Amino acid sequence: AEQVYISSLALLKMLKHGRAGVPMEVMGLMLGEFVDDYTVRVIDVFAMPQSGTGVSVEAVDPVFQAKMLDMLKQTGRPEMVVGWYHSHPGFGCWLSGVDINTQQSFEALSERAVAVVVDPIQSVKGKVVIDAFRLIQALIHGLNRHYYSITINYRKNELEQKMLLNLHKKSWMEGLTLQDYSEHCKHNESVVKEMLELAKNYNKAVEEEDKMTPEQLAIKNVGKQDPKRHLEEHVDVLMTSNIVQCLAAMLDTVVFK
Amino acid sequence: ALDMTTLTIMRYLPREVDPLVYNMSHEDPGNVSYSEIGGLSEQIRELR
Amino acid sequence: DKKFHGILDQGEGVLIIFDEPPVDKTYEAALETIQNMSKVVDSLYNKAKKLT
Amino acid sequence: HGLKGLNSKLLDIRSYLEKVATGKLPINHQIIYQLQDVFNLLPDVSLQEFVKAFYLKTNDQMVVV
Amino acid sequence: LLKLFTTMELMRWSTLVEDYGMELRKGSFGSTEEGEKRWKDLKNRVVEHNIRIMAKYYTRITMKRMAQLLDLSVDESEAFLSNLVVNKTIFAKVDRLAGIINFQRPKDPNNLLNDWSQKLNSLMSLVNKTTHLIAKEEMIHN
C-alpha cells in the first residue's frame, strides 16, 4: 500500500550517474517530501563524489552535502533528504549488509527514509529496473528477512513528455532531402543482384523440404540460411526505400518551383 | 584488470614476467670480470 | 567488331562515334530474377496439385 | 512533418517583409540579397531536360518495385 | 607574369612576347639549343592556358572563332586539343565537318538530378539561415 513517486528528472539524473559510474557502485541523495504514512515523493537528486572505496557510511560527505543544500536553497529547491540512491551494476536490486548499515544511518535521521537501488547495465531500454525499499534473486539476501520491498510510480507532466517525443524525431530541413540518387541506384542494382542469388535458394528449399517435417526442418534451417526470410526482408528495403525516394522527388518537383 | 562481480575491466596492466624471470634476470649476480679466469683467450675473445 | 561504337556515313564521307554505356545492370538482374522465379512457381505448383 | 515546417518559414519571411514595408523596415539589404538568392536557386523548369531526367529515373524505380 | 597566369583570361601570345621578350632574354630562355627549347614550352603552356579557361566559360564553341581566340589556325588547335584529350586535360568532343568543338561533359539523368537535389539542399539553408535574421531584427527592433 505504501509507495513512492519519482519525478522524471530524478529518474534520468539517476540512470545517467549510474550508467556513468560503471562499475563502481556510486551513490547520491534524494530530495523530496513525505506526504503521509503511505507515500514518499522524490522530486530531486544530487550526486555524491566517489572514494577509494565503494558506497558506505562515510562515503556520505557532510561538507559536500550541506554545501549543496544551501546552494539549492538559493534556488528554492528546499526539501528533506528522503532517501539515498545507489547502484549495484550487474547484480540486480538488493541491499548488501553493508548497504544495510548505511540504511540504518539513514533510519536514525528519519524513520521513513528509503533505499533506492538502481542497476545500470541490465536495465534494458524497455522497462527500466529500479527498486526502492527499507529495512526491518534478492531472497538470497533476505528480501523479506532483514528488509522489505516498496512500490514506485512517476509524477508526470503533459509537456515533459512532449519534449521527450522529439527525442527520436528528425531535423528540420528533413523530409525534403533527397539522398544521392546515383548512390541509391547501387542499392537497387546491388540489392536486387544479391537477391537474385537467393531466388535460386528459395527454389531449392521448396523443391527439397517439399518432402519433409518440422523436426527434420530444424536440422536444415538451424544450420543454413533459408532464402525465405531473405527475399521477404530484402524486398522490404527496396519497397519502402524506393517509395520514399520516388515520393520525395514527386514532391520536390511540384512543390519546389 | 578485471572485475569480480561486474566482471569488467578494472584497469589494464602490462605484460608480467612470472616469479621465474626475476631469478634469472635481476637475481643471478655474476662475479669478477673475465680476467678472473683464462688459460685460453680463445673462447674469451671468441665469445666476446 | 564492336570496338569503338560508331557508324560510317558514306554519303557525306563522315565517321560518327558514339559514347555507349547504357546496358543497365539493374534491369538485367531484374530479368534474371524473373527467370529464377518462373522456376520457383512451377515447383510451388508441383506441391499444390499434391496437397489439393 | 517537413512540409508543415516549410510552410511556416515562408510565412515568417512573408509578413516580415511586410513589416519591412510597414513595421518600420530598416533595410537589411543583407536579407533581401539572400531572398533573391533563394529565387535564383529556384529550380524551374519542366524543361525538356528535367522532364526526361525524372522520367528515366522513375522507370528505374518501377523495375525495382 | 605570375599574376598573368593566376587569373583566368585569354592570353593572346603576341602581346606577351612583345612585353616580356626583352626583360626575359636579358637574364643570365637562353640560346637556340637547350634554353631556346623553353620558348616552345612557353607557347605550349599558353595554349593549355587558353584552352584551359575556355573550358570554364564556354558551354559550346565553334572552330574558326576558336582558332582566332587561340591565334593558331585549324591545325595548331586540333593538335593542341588532341594532345590535351589524349593525355587528358579537358573533355571536349569535336564535330569535324568544318564546325564545332564541344566542351560540355557527358552527364546522365542522374548527373542532372544531382544538381537539382544539391540545389534544393542549398536553398533550405537559405530558407533556414534566412529565418534567424528576421527574428534577430524583431528582438533588436520591435
- A97: contact with B, CB 8 A cutoff: no
Q: How far apart are CA D51 and CA D42, in angstroms?
A: 16
Same domain? A97 vs A8: yes
Phi-psi region of A184 (alpha: psi -120 to 50; beta: other; left: phi over 0): alpha
Pick the last residue of a domain from A165, A194, A221.
A165
Same domain? A154 vs A232: no
Evaluate whether residue A196 is within a structural domain: yes
Pick the last residue of a domain from A139, A165, A191.
A165
Q: How far apart are CA A252 and CA D43, in angstroms?
A: 9
Which helix (H) or strand (E) covers residue E68, if one does? Answer: helix E64-69
For residue A4, the 8-state DSSP code is E
Contact flag C30-D63 (C-beta cutoff 8 Å)? yes
Same domain? A12 vs A97: yes
Same domain? A202 vs A228: yes
Same domain? A149 vs A61: yes
Q: How far apart are CA A30 and CA A85, in angstroms?
A: 7
State the total domains in chain A: 2
Evaluate whether residue A119 is within a structural domain: yes
Same domain? A190 vs A153: no
Longest Cα–Cα distance of chain A, Å, equals 79
Grid cell locating A196: 537474385
Same domain? A182 vs A221: yes
Q: How far apart are CA A107 and CA A134, in angstroms?
A: 9
**Cell 508441383, residue?**
C46
The burial of E30, by beta-carbon neighbours within 10 Å (0-12 exposed, 13-18 middle, 19 or more buried), is given as middle
- Cβ neighbours of D52 in C, within 8 Å: none
**Angle in degrees, 0-180, between the axes of helices A181-209 and E109-140, rounded to the nearest 10:** 120
Same domain? A43 vs A141: yes
Same domain? A130 vs A202: no
Evaluate whether residue A256 is within a structural domain: no
> What are the beta bridge partners of residue E60?
E102
Evaluate whether residue A171 is within a structural domain: no
| Residue in D42, D57, D64 nearest the CB of A238 | D64
> What are the beta bridge partners of residue C14?
C9
Angle at C38 between CA C36 and CA C40, to 5 degrees: 70
Same domain? A88 vs A127: yes
Residue among E37, E51, E46 at smallest CA distance from E13: E46
Q: What are phi and psi of B14, to 5 degrees?
A: -100, -170
Q: How many CB atoms lie within 10 A of CB E103?
A: 21
Pick the last residue of a domain from A165, A196, A220.
A165
> Beta strand A39-47 with A3-6: parallel, antiparallel or unpaired?
parallel
| Strand ranges in chain A using DSSP code E only, listed in sequence order | 3-6, 27-33, 39-47, 80-86, 114-118, 130-135, 147-149, 152-153
Chains B and A touch (3+ CB pairs under 8 A): yes
- C48: contact with E, CB 8 A cutoff: no
Evaluate whether residue A73 is within a structural domain: yes
Host domain of residue A191 = 176-250
Residues 6+ apart with CB under 8 A from A151: A2, A3, A4, A132
> What are the beta bridge partners of residue A80?
A32
E→C contacts (Cβ < 8 Å), by residue, are 96-97, 106
Same domain? A110 vs A203: no
Residue environment code for A44-77, b if the CB has 16+ CB neighbours within 10 A, otherwise e: bbbbbeeeeeebeeebbeeeeeeebbeeeeeeee
Contact flag D43-A192 (C-beta cutoff 8 Å)? no
Grid cell locating C50: 499434391
Same domain? A153 vs A218: no
